[PDB]
Amino acid sequence: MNNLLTQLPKHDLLKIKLVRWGFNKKPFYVLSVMKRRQARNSGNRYEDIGWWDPSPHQDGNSHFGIKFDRVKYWLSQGAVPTEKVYGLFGQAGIIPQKPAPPKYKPADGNADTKWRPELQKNL
Amino acid sequence: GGFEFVGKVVSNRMQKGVVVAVNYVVWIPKYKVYERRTARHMAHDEGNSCVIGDIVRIQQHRKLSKNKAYVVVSTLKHADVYNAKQAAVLNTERSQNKLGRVEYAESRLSEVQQRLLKLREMYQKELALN
Amino acid sequence: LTVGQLLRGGRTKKVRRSKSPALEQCPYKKGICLRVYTTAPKKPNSANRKVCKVQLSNGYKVLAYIPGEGHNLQEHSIVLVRGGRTKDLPGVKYKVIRGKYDCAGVKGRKTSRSKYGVKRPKE
RNA sequence: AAUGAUGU
RNA sequence: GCACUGGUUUCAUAAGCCAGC
RNA sequence: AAACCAAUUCAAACAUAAGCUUAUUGUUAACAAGGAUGAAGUCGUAACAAGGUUUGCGUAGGGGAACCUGCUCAAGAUUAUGCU
RNA sequence: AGUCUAUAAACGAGAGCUGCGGUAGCAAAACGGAUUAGAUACCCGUGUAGUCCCAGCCGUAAAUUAUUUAUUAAAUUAAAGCGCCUAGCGAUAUU
RNA sequence: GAGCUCCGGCUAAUUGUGUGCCAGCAGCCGCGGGAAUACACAAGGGGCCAGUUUAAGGUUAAAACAAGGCAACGGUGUUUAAAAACUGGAAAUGC
RNA sequence: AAAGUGUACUUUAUAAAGUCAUUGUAUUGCUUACAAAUAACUAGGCAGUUGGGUCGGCUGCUAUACUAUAGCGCCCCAAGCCUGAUAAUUAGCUAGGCGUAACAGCGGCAAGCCACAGUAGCACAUAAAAAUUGCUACCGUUAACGCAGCAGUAAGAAAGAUUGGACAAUAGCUUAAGGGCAGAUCCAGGUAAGCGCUAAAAUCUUUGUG
RNA sequence: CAUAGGGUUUGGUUUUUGCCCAGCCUUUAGCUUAGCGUUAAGCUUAUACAUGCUAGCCUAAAAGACGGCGCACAGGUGCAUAUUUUGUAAGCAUGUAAAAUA
Ligand SMILES: [K+]
Ligand SMILES: [K+]
Ligand SMILES: [K+]
Ligand SMILES: [K+]
Ligand SMILES: [K+]
Ligand SMILES: [K+]
Ligand SMILES: [K+]
Ligand SMILES: [K+]
Ligand SMILES: [Mg+2]
Ligand SMILES: [Mg+2]
Ligand SMILES: [Mg+2]
Ligand SMILES: [Mg+2]
Ligand SMILES: [Mg+2]
Ligand SMILES: [Mg+2]
Ligand SMILES: [Mg+2]
Ligand SMILES: [Mg+2]
Ligand SMILES: [Mg+2]
Ligand SMILES: [Mg+2]
Ligand SMILES: [Mg+2]
Ligand SMILES: [Mg+2]
Ligand SMILES: [Mg+2]
Ligand SMILES: [Mg+2]
Ligand SMILES: [Mg+2]
Ligand SMILES: [Mg+2]
Ligand SMILES: [Mg+2]
Ligand SMILES: [Mg+2]
Secondary structure, eight states, rough: OOOHHHHHHHSSSEEEEEEEEOTTTTTOEEEEEESSOOOOTTTTSEEEHHHHHHHHOOOOEEEEOOOOOHHHHHHTOEEEEEEHHHHHHHTTTOOOOOOOOOOOOOOOOOSSSSTHHHHHHHH | OOOOEEEEEEOOOOTTTTEEEEEEEEETTTTTTTEEEEEEEEEOOOOOOOOOOOEEEEEOOOSSSEEEEEEEEEEEEEEEOOOOHHHHHHHHHHHHOOHHHHHHHHHHHHHHHHHHHHHHHHHHHHHHHH | OHHHHHHOOOOOOOOOOSSSSGGSSOOOOEEEHHHHHEEEOOOOOOOOEEEEEEEEEESOEEEEOOSSSOOOOOOOOOOOOOOOOOSSSSSOOEOOOOSSSSSOOOOOOSSOOOGTTTTOOOO
16 A cells, blocks of 8 residues: 655755654654655655654653665665754664754744643643 | 567458457455456567467567557467468379279378377487486 | 356346335435325224325425324425335335424423423523 | 125 | 204124114 | 739629528427325235146236136146056 | 268248139038027027248248267266256347 | 434334324334324333434445256247367268 | 855954855756446447548757657548447545455445536646636635634534634744744533443551550 | 354245344434543435635844745545556666876
């Protein structure tokens, strides 16, 4: 059914992206090689390369799986990771960490409650 | 599929053209049988001398016209063509002379014996090669 | 059949008709009453059964049986019709749902109130 | 020597 | 005259019969 | 510049949306027929026994109705007194 | 040099139709005499088409047992190629 | 604990009162004509359960390729027969 | 090409860089075969129709292959081509999915491909593109508009949810001064698929007191 | 991980054919209904639509788009389409061609 694409794009870029596969307030991500301009959860892919569980477990750590050999192959071909994927690769030691620009905007004071009306009802 | 076919010539009425018939089977999952079907293909004939009834081999080729996308490569069997002049000669030979009951039977026996002897020699050679 | 006969459309799937063709494959249908009267059953039964002639919203006209003891249906009354055949009445293949727009429930009913559109007495 | 009401 | 009601009859009914109106 | 590119202008050709016709699609109709069904109307008695003229098929004619008669055919007709 | 037949064609009782010739016997229809509650039937007396010959039309029957191979007294057993049936009831439907 | 439905047989679950082929019930066979476990109500009991019981669709309860009939009814009037499918056969002449 | 180049643009007592313009070994591809619902109370269909020859089929700038999709178009020439064809009815296709021991049957969910945006004909738009781009005619309301984008309203129907919050996360557009945009998306509201738990107190749970 | 039947046609029996019921899956209607967390979902009209919103950002030849990049991505529906499509397989010439290194 979901045959992987073989021909490379001619007018767009390839990227390594995170695909949301969680539940209500229980995120879970899968890393795949997809065309830059598509739907987030589109079935068009070249390969699935890893997974990530951002929440802590009883051991206090987050868990991350990746294909070491295939990550190098797609990086060589020209696939461009997103900002978050760069962070995962940097910490995992696959490639050097990417520096971030300086920030001046006053950070948001309501980040975990601004978008959740249920909490605001109690507030 | 459809790269090569072997079929019979059913039409030579076109200029450097021919139509060839092909047989094939299709699997019917519900009844567990193979169904025999037929198709017609038009091919390019450079020689322009094909005869209806020949067995020929056609091969995939670049499109040449609306309904012609094949080329004739070789002929496996040539169709028989009646020739009045040759038939008349045979009739004259048959009517030239007649033999009796015994003479005809003896001649038939001798001819079979000679054919059998040659066949035995060929078979022995084949065994020697083996 | 032979193999040749089976290949040439030998077998044809059996077709079965519906029991309430006037419903057009719908669970219910709305209509308006044209005439209200009584009819006598076939042998060996004997009674004066209440029936009404209803024109459905799709334009069809059918005979509907009124269950229960007593009714307030008159001409030009909106009713809801379902499937169901009365065996002793010839030609009646539909029934009127009681308790809906115009039809009311049987007064004094205590058992099987749901099938006759009677609410539970609070007192 | 025409006829043999209905239901069970 | 019919009609209508009641009786008669029967396991019950129809019909028949009878009376009233 | 006689070349190319971006414009304005008139003329000719091309096909075409649109447009016209169209059987007969559906609605609808005085009236004359058919079929199905319905506790207890009427005339006859055609079939089931040898059913009281054996039954039936094809075709033709006739009769209030079932049915009747001619011609060939079918059995789906069970048919008990030899010889000299 | 075969089996079977999608499709196509030919042959085809009796009755019936058109023309020509013939018409004894038999006999639809028809007309009388009886039987019977009635007899519009059965029975009796007359009796025309028809039955017959030649040339055309019609193509219908309760117009035989499905066809073929092997085995077989039959049968039975296993195969090859077809046609038809899918509760009954109900059209002079349309084409 | 709280509702919906059912208690003649298929199908787990009965007594009383009222009605008297009336009122009504009904998926099928069927109940009601003065002695109704089948109608209406009361009590008792069965099933499921924040659900429960009708109505309407898909599929199953072998429609038959595995796997049905022409022996209840169906093989057609007969023969000839260059498609298709299957597949070797015992013919012609003379007094 | 995650590249090179510039008499070009911007920032610097701190300088690395980016922005704009331009550049690729032939400079963005066509063709054929098989399968897939009913249907003969649809039997004939086709005349550019089947085949052959010249010419045309543009957007240049390696060399040959004797011109290297095509009745795709004009002119000419030869009569061929199809025949369960032609004409009709119905349906978006694949597949997850539901029943069944299976074979078969039917078509709610995630995703892929195709078609369309009131109807029809056209221009751009080739190669990845027209809901929110144009021209013309027509239909319906009132020179304008067409919600099959989210929410919402009216009618129809047995039966179709709020005129909600936020860009905090994921993906996307723009930007070297680290920002801006977003009814995709993430959360909340509403509707008895389904799954889990509560609807009673107990030495104030000896996982205690001290 | 592997195939279940029962009722019915009123002289009896055997036999053939039809009809009805028990399962699972999916929507409405009657009666009834406390709360919290969460999975999968919005199944009839390509019927007509008031109002708000869904694609903009950046720069500048004199403080301004006329210029650059996007709208070729997302989101909606299944009118039309029996094959124009969908699902698959196959085909498409050359040592990439030049130059005394005499
Ligand atoms: K009642
Ligand atoms: K005859
Ligand atoms: K006969
Ligand atoms: K049968
Ligand atoms: K016959
Ligand atoms: K269109
Ligand atoms: K709809
Ligand atoms: K640019
Ligand atoms: Mg009840
Ligand atoms: Mg009488
Ligand atoms: Mg008599
Ligand atoms: Mg008699
Ligand atoms: Mg008799
Ligand atoms: Mg005979
Ligand atoms: Mg019991
Ligand atoms: Mg019961
Ligand atoms: Mg009761
Ligand atoms: Mg459609
Ligand atoms: Mg349009
Ligand atoms: Mg787009
Ligand atoms: Mg609209
Ligand atoms: Mg909307
Ligand atoms: Mg971002
Ligand atoms: Mg409900
Ligand atoms: Mg099951
Ligand atoms: Mg830029």
